[PDB]
Design a protein around this ligand. Sequence first.
Ligand SMILES: C[C@H](NC(=O)[C@H](CCCNC(=N)N)NC(=O)[C@H](C)NC(=O)[C@@H](N)CO)C(=O)NCc1ccc(/N=N/c2ccc(CO)cc2)cc1
Length: 300
Amino acid sequence: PNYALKFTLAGHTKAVSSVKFSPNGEWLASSSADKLIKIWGAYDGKFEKTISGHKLGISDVAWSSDSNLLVSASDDKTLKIWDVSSGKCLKTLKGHSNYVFCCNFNPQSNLIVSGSFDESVRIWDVKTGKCLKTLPAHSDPVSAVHFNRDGSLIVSSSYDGLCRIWDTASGQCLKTLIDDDNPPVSFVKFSPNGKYILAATLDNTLKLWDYSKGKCLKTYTGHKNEKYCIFANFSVTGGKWIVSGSEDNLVYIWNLQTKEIVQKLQGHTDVVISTACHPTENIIASAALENDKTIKLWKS
Ligand SMILES: C[C@H](NC(=O)[C@H](CCCNC(=N)N)NC(=O)[C@H](C)NC(=O)[C@@H](N)CO)C(=O)NCc1ccc(/N=N/c2ccc(CO)cc2)cc1
């Protein structure tokens, strides 16, 4: 593949924590330590609007499946749901007793999952803003939470070194993924077809798990990840890649099945905390920490 820099997006006055393409493919949303959400044109990199409300910085942000709603996870121990077009804050989800780190809508977008430094995972009702469930998920901060394709499953990861898979409806743990040693898991998500999960660990290692068999299938290295919870992705619109940020300021792209680094992206001046893949085009968004403060758009 041949991702080349097309756009640099400037505006956040602090570190960007997370970037996400809207499912309809028209927008990019960005979260920052500057307590703000910014929305950008996915194709032209053009600034669109600021969404504000959080009392502290934001670690994560997620789109509903109809691109109308945003959820954001903040250090002010709350989530807020946002009507994107109007800018309204529709609900504030309160219940976490520490930094909310990660969040996600289910496909049906009637639920939100959140993971927190209170070591718990919570399931929220979108429409009412009420917490449906609280799972005793981990013995250390929750780094990532994610629904599978049909929303039946949740996967969560944690500095405790574990990935657990949860039944959305009943809240019971269906599986604990554990390998030959448990370095902290910094990131986790299902593959789009929901057959696999990708997990990132603070030992400079990406791992592709077959979660039904419960066996680790592929491993992806060469990048540097010993400290931050760096988002990683499946790119599936062109070839099949793994895409991850890295603490050496590069964006890394691997061939999924042969595991070879096929492209390193240059440009950022600080840790690439976050990357995102466009739902229908060969586009990547990447974002960096305090010394860089920019978002880059790469097209292939
Ligand atoms: C701005 C950025 N924020 C974060 O790295 C994370 C969210 C990263 C992306 N979000 C996601 N993956 N869901 N958030 C935070 O650190 C805190 C909770 N919140 C904020 O910073 C917000 N203001 C904005 O995100 C940051 O640099 N925080 C400071 C920091 C300090 C130490 C650290 N790990 N340091 C270590 C970790 C482990 C070890 C030994 O194992 C040693 C050092 C990791 C981060």
